[PDB]
Design a binder for these strands. Structure first.
Lengths: 46, 106, 79, 94, 99, 93, 108, 80, 93
DNA sequence: GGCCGCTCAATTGGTCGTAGACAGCTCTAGCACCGCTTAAACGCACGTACGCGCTGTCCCCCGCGTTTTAACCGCCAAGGGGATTACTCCCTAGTCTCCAGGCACGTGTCAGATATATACATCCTGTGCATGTAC
DNA sequence: GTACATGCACAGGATGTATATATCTGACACGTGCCTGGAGACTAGGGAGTAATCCCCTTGGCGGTTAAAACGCGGGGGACAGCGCGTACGTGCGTTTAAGCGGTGCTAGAGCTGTCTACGACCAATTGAGCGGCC
């Protein structure tokens, strides 16, 4: 079945782990933010 | 003709039910007519915001049915929800994906 | 003795979710004391709410209220 | 008997926020328990705030301070903004 | 595919798999049977609702995850990648949870 | 004019019942007044929840017995329950 | 017909049963307070007050002072494995701290 | 203005010595001032909102004590 | 000798009980931190004392737990990296 | 150079004054607490029915005992960075003070907001059924 | 490729509601007097600064044993029916607590007398090192 796409997500994230090219949490869009989150991002930009 | 306190104030949250819960919870012998409107609006805002973030996390994981995991992603990403909910636990929510640094290979 | 039923693999998984890279062999036993003393808090509180209600049966509310009193609130079961 | 609960309002908010989206009965259990917990937290703090002033009444001011005590950060400001907008609609509607 | 593998790699793969998924790690019946031993020492012949014994499990696994996640941090701080009982006792004392 | 309504006379009586020679500094009186008033808020607070979680209106001796049984640690629970049962036993005769 | 006796004296307590009933009924802990409640609670406050004062007295007397000061209260809470759980997150004004050295610091 | 720096090095040194540490690495001082400023920031932010609620210009000892109860870090003796 | 006068000093401040922070620096620091929550506030003298006791107790409690962290790392010397551990696993940040 | 007897410059001793701070009154006055009503609604006792939880018989994948082995801990050795400690010099924290002003408290008085009695109607919870999402 | 779980359609009872009624709480403007913010003068305790030096932590290196990962074996965890012990309800009931209005006990404030410790200072004794006498 289509589970080869989720197996490819595992292969992509392991290829990036063998390369060592990742965030400090090891994990791999402003339009979608709440008005509060826009205010917090504006507060981070100031 | 009547109009519900909820629909008059413009909330989807149940102002009448909040009024009874404040009156019958013995939080006081007297409850102000504004108090359950104001409280319903805050419960609504919190419920709208925690759901908006969960729905975004669900669609970003290509599912349309919100399940406890999506709430746990929403709550633990945004630090003001993570401070509000703090120490509470979500049934079958799991944990926010986080391989700690230094363990992460070189 | 049913506490030795908390299997060595179960504690591997249950710690691996917490992100530990490597276990040490003493953890698999010592953790059972920590789980047992956590349960031995919430059960005695939950049973206390249950006996107070004059119930024979421990309900979901009897344990969720114990967890709320322990300051480790659990959502999703009951309210 | 009746299992009095928030489930239809939570769902009615979800269809206002994301019209396509659906929600599991486990998540409805969470949303009920979350609303009931936030509610007991805020009304709990409002009752203490009334006692500290030796008032009887839970007026809307008592909720405003309990909200800006319990909610953190900018979330507190947005909640108070929603509350003051709501009471403004209600008192303007008569 | 390979033979013998590279140690530590299957641990990192396990971390990803057990953080990505939310199933109960403790097998249900061993825990369902454990809770009744803790019960006999304070009330005989108790009866448990089908939800409640599982809500205890959700609280236990959320507590143990929420302890190993701090224990790991003590080990890393202590110039190790391996957790040990001397970390667990410390995480407890710093939380104020016993001693 | 307002009144402070402390427990000071009662805690003073209780000290004088167990260390008859001993004194309380007004600072230690302050600490004890807080401790009594804080345990009262904790016990009565928990007794209220023990009513709502059973949908009773009242709080009665068995609600406070359960609040004590929860709120206190080890020996202090069984001692406090022994004291409460003595007091209501005497009061009901 | 008349001539009262205090509900404290009828209970056999030094603690104020009247005050406790008045506080339970006005505090909104419920719309109703049963007559056994304030009696039993007054006894519990008296017991915990007796315990913490008795240990404070011993701590003061062993420190050779005839008077309780916040130091002798703090040294009575922290030296008891039970009260230190009951008061596990209280601060005592002017109390200081339990005297203790971690053994790895202790010299030679 | 400068007052966070006004918590003297010796004051933090004594304050740690009561807590029973033997040696302080010198980066502790500037960092500790940050922690203490965060703790007062939380307590004062709470206590000021109790004070504003009472429509009152003066922070009383009860308002800071109630803020400390609200944070689950209770304090006795200062009234209540 | 070094570290011996420090170890004798610990015994001196654990037997002692008075405030370790200078009043006026703490008095100004409370007002300074208040300014951007509200202008023009008045502080009751006893409130600043209560806040000071809360802070000194909190800091002592943090250093007591920080000592455990450094000693767990086989150091008798505390470091910022220990404070970041203790305040993390307290759940405070 | 070595012994001892007056001088006057030397500590160590005992009785007075006071101030902090309870302590025990010692009123004394004002206010909560107790008593004895009458009333009404909560909780209790006690049936009855139904969920619901024990205690029961099948079964695969997980638990686990054994095996190598390699990477991490713990140990040790060396060394320079850095915290202590020991003074030194200065200043700002502590204090007590007085003004002098701001405002927390209290009291008299009001009105408007809220409890609550009750008659309708519309909301939403239990059931049933349709159908698409997660697996 | 499948069907269990959500999502919509419907009835109906309970609870939310509009309105009138009565009132007491909270808001307001008044004064009393408390006490906090400012700003000052002086001492001296604590603080900033430095130089000197010890020893601690950091690092790098090593060997040992411990956990990981793989493997085959087999046991017990996961998933389906039968009994009956409870848990939720409904009713009828009476005991319990509230409300209300008095009278007295007691508790708080204020003030006082009183120790009584505990801390300096003065009043009055004495002890000794400082020295000359003598041969």
């Amino acid at each position: 079945g289509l589970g080869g796409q989720e197996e490819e997500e595992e292969q992509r994230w392991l290829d990036a782990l063998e390369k060592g090219e990742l965030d400090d949490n090891g994990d791999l869009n402003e339009r979608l933010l709440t008005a509060r989150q826009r205010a917090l991002l504006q507060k981070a930009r100031s | 003709k009547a109009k519900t306190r909820s629909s008059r104030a413009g909330l989807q949250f149940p102002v009448g039910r909040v009024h009874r819960l404040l009156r019958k919870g013995n939080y006081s012998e007297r409850v102000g007519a504004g108090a359950p409107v104001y409280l319903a609006a805050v419960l609504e805002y919190l419920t709208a915001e925690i759901l908006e973030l969960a729905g975004n996390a669900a669609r970003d994981n290509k599912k349309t049915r919100i399940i406890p995991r999506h709430l746990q992603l929403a709550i633990r990403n945004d630090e003001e929800l993570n401070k509000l909910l703090g120490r509470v636990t979500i049934a079958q929510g799991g944990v926010l994906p986080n391989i700690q640094a230094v363990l992460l290979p070189k | 003795d049913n506490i030795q039923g908390i299997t060595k693999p179960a504690i591997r998984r249950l710690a691996r979710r917490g992100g530990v890279k490597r276990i040490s062999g003493l953890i698999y036993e010592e953790t059972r004391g920590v789980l047992k003393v956590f349960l031995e808090n919430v059960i005695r509180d939950a049973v206390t709410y249950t006996e107070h209600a004059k119930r024979k049966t421990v309900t979901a509310m009897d344990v969720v209220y114990a967890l709320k009193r322990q300051g480790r609130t659990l959502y999703g079961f009951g309210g | 008997s009746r299992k009095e609960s928030y489930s239809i309002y939570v769902y009615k908010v979800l269809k206002q926020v994301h019209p396509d989206t659906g929600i599991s009965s486990k998540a409805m259990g969470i949303m009920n328990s979350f609303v009931n917990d936030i509610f007991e937290r805020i009304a709990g703090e409002a009752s203490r705030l009334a006692h500290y002033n030796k008032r009887s009444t839970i007026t809307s001011r008592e909720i405003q301070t309990a909200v800006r005590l319990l909610l953190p950060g900018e979330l507190a400001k947005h909640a108070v903004s929603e509350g003051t907008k709501a009471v403004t609609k209600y008192t303007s509607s008569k | 595919k390979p033979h013998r593998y590279r140690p530590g790699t299957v641990a990192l793969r396990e971390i990803r798999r057990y953080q990505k998924s939310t199933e109960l790690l403790i097998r249900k019946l061993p825990f369902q049977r454990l809770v009744r031993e803790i019960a006999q020492d304070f009330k005989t012949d108790l009866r448990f609702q089908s939800s409640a014994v599982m809500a205890l499990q959700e609280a236990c696994e959320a507590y143990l995850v929420g302890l190993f996640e701090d224990t790991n941090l003590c080990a890393i701080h202590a110039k190790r990648v391996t957790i040990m009982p001397k970390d667990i006792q410390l995480a407890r004392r710093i939380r104020g949870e016993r001693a």
